[PDB]
Amino acid sequence: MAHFKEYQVIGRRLPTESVPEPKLFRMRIFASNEVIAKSRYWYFLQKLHKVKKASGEIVSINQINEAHPTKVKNFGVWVRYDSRSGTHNMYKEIRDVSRVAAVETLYQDMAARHRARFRSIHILKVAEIEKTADVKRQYVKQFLTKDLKFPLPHRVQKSTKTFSYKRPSTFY
Amino acid sequence: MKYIQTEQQIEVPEGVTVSIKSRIVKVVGPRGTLTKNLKHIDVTFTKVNNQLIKVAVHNGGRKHVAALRTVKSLVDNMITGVTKGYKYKMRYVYAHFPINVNIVEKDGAKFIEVRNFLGDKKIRNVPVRDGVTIEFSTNVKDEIVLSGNSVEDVSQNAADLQQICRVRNKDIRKFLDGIYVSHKGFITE
Amino acid sequence: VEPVVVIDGKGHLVGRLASVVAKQLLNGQKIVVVRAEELNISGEFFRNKLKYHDFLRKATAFNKTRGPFHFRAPSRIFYKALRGMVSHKTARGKAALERLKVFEGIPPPYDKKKRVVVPQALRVLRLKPGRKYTTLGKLSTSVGWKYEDVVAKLEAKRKVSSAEYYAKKRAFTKKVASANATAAESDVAKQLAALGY
Amino acid sequence: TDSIVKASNWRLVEVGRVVLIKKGQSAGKLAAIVEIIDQKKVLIDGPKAGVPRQAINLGQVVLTPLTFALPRGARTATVSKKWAAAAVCEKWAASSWAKKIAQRERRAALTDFERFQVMVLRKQKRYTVKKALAKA
Amino acid sequence: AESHRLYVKGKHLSYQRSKRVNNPNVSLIKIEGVATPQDAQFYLGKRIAYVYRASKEVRGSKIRVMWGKVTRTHGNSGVVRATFRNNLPAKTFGASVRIFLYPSNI
RNA sequence: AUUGUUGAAAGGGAAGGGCAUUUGAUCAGGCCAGCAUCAGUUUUGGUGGCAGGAUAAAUCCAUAGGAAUGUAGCUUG
RNA sequence: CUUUGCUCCACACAAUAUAGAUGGAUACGAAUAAGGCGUCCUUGUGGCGUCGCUGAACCAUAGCAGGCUAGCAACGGUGCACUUGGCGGAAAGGCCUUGGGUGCUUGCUGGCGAAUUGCAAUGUCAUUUUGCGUGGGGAUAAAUCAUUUGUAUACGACUUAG
Ligand SMILES: [Mg+2]
Numbered sequence A: 001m002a003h004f005k006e007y008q009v010i011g012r013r014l015p016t017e018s019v020p021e022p023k024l025f026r027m028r029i030f031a032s033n034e035v036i037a038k039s040r041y042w043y044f045l046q047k048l049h050k051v052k053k054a055s056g057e058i059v060s061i062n063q064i065n066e067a068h069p070t071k072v073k074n075f076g077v078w079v080r081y082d083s084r085s086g087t088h089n090m091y092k093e094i095r096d097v098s099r100v101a102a103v104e105t106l107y108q109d110m111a112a113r114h115r116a117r118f119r120s121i122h123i124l125k126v127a128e129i130e131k132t133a134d135v136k137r138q139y140v141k142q143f144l145t146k147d148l149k150f151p152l153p154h155r156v157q158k159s160t161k162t163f164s165y166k167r168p169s170t171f172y
Numbered sequence B: 001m002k003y004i005q006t007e008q009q010i011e012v013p014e015g016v017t018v019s020i021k022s023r024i025v026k027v028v029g030p031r032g033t034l035t036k037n038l039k040h041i042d043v044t045f046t047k048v049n050n051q052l053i054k055v056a057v058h059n060g061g062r063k064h065v066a067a068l069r070t071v072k073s074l075v076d077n078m079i080t081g082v083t084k085g086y087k088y089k090m091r092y093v094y095a096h097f098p099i100n101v102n103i104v105e106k107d108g109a110k111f112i113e114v115r116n117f118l119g120d121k122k123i124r125n126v127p128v129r130d131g132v133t134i135e136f137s138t139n140v141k142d143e144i145v146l147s148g149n150s151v152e153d154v155s156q157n158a159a160d161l162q163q164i165c166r167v168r169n170k171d172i173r174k175f176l177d178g179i180y181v182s183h184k185g186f187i188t189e
Numbered sequence C: 001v002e003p004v005v006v007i008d009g010k011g012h013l014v015g016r017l018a019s020v021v022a023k024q025l026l027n028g029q030k031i032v033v034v035r036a037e038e039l040n041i042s043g044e045f046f047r048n049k050l051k052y053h054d055f056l057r058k059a060t061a062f063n064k065t066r067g068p069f070h071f072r073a074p075s076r077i078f079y080k081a082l083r084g085m086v087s088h089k090t091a092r093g094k095a096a097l098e099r100l101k102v103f104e105g106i107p108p109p110y111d112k113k114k115r116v117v118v119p120q121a122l123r124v125l126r127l128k129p130g131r132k133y134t135t136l137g138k139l140s141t142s143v144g145w146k147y148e149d150v151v152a153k154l155e156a157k158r159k160v161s162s163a164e165y166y167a168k169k170r171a172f173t174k175k176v177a178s179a180n181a182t183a184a185e186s187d188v189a190k191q192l193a194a195l196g197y
Numbered sequence D: 001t002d003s004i005v006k007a008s009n010w011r012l013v014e015v016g017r018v019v020l021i022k023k024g025q026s027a028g029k030l031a032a033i034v035e036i037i038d039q040k041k042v043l044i045d046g047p048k049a050g051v052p053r054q055a056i057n058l059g060q061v062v063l064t065p066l067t068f069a070l071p072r073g074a075r076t077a078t079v080s081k082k083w084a085a086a087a088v089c090e091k092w093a094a095s096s097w098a099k100k101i102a103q104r105e106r107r108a109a110l111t112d113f114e115r116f117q118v119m120v121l122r123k124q125k126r127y128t129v130k131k132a133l134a135k136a
Numbered sequence E: 001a002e003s004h005r006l007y008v009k010g011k012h013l014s015y016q017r018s019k020r021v022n023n024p025n026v027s028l029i030k031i032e033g034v035a036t037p038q039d040a041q042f043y044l045g046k047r048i049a050y051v052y053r054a055s056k057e058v059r060g061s062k063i064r065v066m067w068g069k070v071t072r073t074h075g076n077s078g079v080v081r082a083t084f085r086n087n088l089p090a091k092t093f094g095a096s097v098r099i100f101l102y103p104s105n106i
Numbered sequence F: 001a002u003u004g005u006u007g008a009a010a011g012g013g014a015a016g017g018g019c020a021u022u023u024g025a026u027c028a029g030g031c032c033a034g035c036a037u038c039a040g041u042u043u044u045g046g047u048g049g050c051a052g053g054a055u056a057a058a059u060c061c062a063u064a065g066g067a068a069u070g071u072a073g074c075u076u077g
Numbered sequence G: 001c002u003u004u005g006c007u008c009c010a011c012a013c014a015a016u017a018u019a020g021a022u023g024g025a026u027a028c029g030a031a032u033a034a035g036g037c038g039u040c041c042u043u044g045u046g047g048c049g050u051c052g053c054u055g056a057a058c059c060a061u062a063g064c065a066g067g068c069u070a071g072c073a074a075c076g077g078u079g080c081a082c083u084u085g086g087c088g089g090a091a092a093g094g095c096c097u098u099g100g101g102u103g104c105u106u107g108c109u110g111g112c113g114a115a116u117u118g119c120a121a122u123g124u125c126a127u128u129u130u131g132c133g134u135g136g137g138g139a140u141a142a143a144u145c146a147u148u149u150g151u152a153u154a155c156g157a158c159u160u161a162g
């Protein structure tokens, strides 16, 4: 995809004479633009309800910004995806400052570790884990210890020139 | 998963003095001195006090972190060796032909010579690594005792001796002859 | 910038160094590489030995003098890597390779000249720490190079002479840096500090 | 006698560590680390310099030797209060690192006439220095 | 002084080209000290000379010149394109050229 | 066609050809450039005014409630 | 030992033609989960201090492409030729050093010159190779064919002798 935005998309079946005010359905959709967000909205509505873009209408599309975009949060993320063989559910945890940053990481991860492309993935739910006891993954838990410090050994400074007149130091 | 920090402790006892610089460890105790190059591993040693060295890995994978406890053991064994020392005992085993072991010199070298192994006319020779000390116990029949500061030198020298007496072209379940390690331990207990 | 550049091969990766040298020569810069025996290759020794053996298998079946020729010396292994990154059958490529010299150790006249490094090819800046690597002198010896010990003897001698040179310059650099410090707190020095000097 | 292990005396990514931003639109400015996101990302904030509170890849930053006391996840006003109390700006300006950055900037700014004046002054300083090396 | 130079040093690297077709009508020049297209913008329009020597004196000299101008930047690393009144000969790949400071906009 | 001599030139497992220019030789009938102000096409910068959205979200300020990776204080060891 | 042939050096004068001068290739070694420099002392895998975060440096750099002159202050810097002693064999063919000589000095202060190349044109300052002529030194052979040998041989070649 790209750098993600999150969108509220609200749709409905078109009014009939019989049903003049159909029920409104809402989704939160992560997508890089509105055009893709609308496409995903129909993609999912058609899996759930008897409706399709032809027989329906988008009533609203609104970007949802992060409430506190410089608070560090621990997100739980539930995912469905297709392997080569089958289909699997997965819970992963991601530490970031926004839902949109968490999802970018999620998508990059699933690509790295499971070779799952965007087309193969459904984000079922994304939710801030309110309490540190409820974090279930060691790879997140280790960033939640008291007075966390750590060095960055073996620093490599990128050179502008091809030649250097002294051997470099990797100190920091 | 890369672990942010893993850490082991090395307990230095009273008599011994550990110097470490660019991962070249010198230990010095009553029984003498051992050194060990560890430049093949990225670890960080740190002195808590005179009685405690910490060794740590930062941002390490599973394989890297496995090395850390190895490093602890290798340095701990250096310390054990230069206080308590190491002493491996080996028994001779034979149905018929008495294995005949004794120390010789080939140009001021030192060599464990093994004669009559399964009645062989071949004379087997095993160098004595520097810093290992051989002695034949009197109380126990057919027992050689290797001993030294360095467990790596001691233990390898015993293996050198165990292996020279391997039996060929025979069923080794029956032909159990050999010189086997019976006891690994310390000099002072 | 310099009319000749002398690269100390030590601690550099064969391919990454080759790629930079090749480009420099094609752009008309004379280069000299020294200490080709101290050059590294990523991958454990055994792997790199196996690769060299695969290369030794290749020969013109009907007459082995028709090549390929399997040079064993460190300098010539480096030269092979380079020759492959230059269009060496053209006149432009022949000209480019005339602008290059490679040596084991640091012979005269280059023993008394500044040696640069190439950070984009340094092993210590490029390999992930923990990854295993070959040193090219060891590799060369294993596949039939005969002068590892001679180069080592000659390099030990050069480094004795070089350490004495350095000890003298380090002494003269004190006298200078001392005399520059007394020059501070003069009007001229304070004026210079205004203008960034 | 005494054991003697060395050290390796690293700058630590920690809350309160001051950093010099190297890449981007805040490049050259200082900022404190406020929280650690993961091994590569941290939340920084540079109220004094006008670095906005932000998550940043540690690759875009250089850890400095300066650190000051700061609670984890302190908001910008708190960062700003503790920064000025701790005198982080002046501690930085006293460093050889900061002075070199300044010098490089000063030399870059020189007029052609100023470059000429510099040559004339260096010739003067050289005269007296080389006279002193002759005696001693 | 020791120095008398009022030009920047460059090297003729290549003709403009794809993988397997060159275009001698445009040359590529690496200017010393220019590492980005932003910096290279300064040199656009500046006159370039390739100076070279010949055996036969013509019009009271044995030095000859091919004049060109820098036209636009090339790539991300401060190489520039240049065009000469007559195209530079291919023998000069690797040769030095002189980028003058005129026509000036300082 | 093929050959001799002379002259000129090139030649690391063919030669020859295309585009381009260097060099040499040769040759017929204004030639080659620089700056300014414009026009056509285009490329790359600087900078100004506006509109929208949760009339951005935030930061910030005020206020109510909360807890912990629990600050002060306190109590033990 | 006669076309005065050969060679080296200095100096002109021609040609030659450049894979590409245009202030300076500016010398520790080793490590990189570590080092450099300074300093102190019990000289150590020592204590203390300091540096890095690139050479964006350092050195050089003003004068008719750099003229002609007068002073001041230092006795320093630097070029050239000549000397002293030493070190360098990896491809040393270079590094260092003594001494005096002779220039120059922009460390500081003066005087005179520069125009018309006409508003730019490389606007010619480098480096090879070879010839040729002057002066000064220096040296005074071989190989091949033909003959001959048979340890050699298709022919060349090889190995012998004169
Ligand atoms: Mg059998």
Ligand SMILES: [Mg+2]
Pocket: C144
């Ligand atoms: Mg062979």
Ligand SMILES: [Mg+2]
Pocket: none
């Ligand atoms: Mg226009």
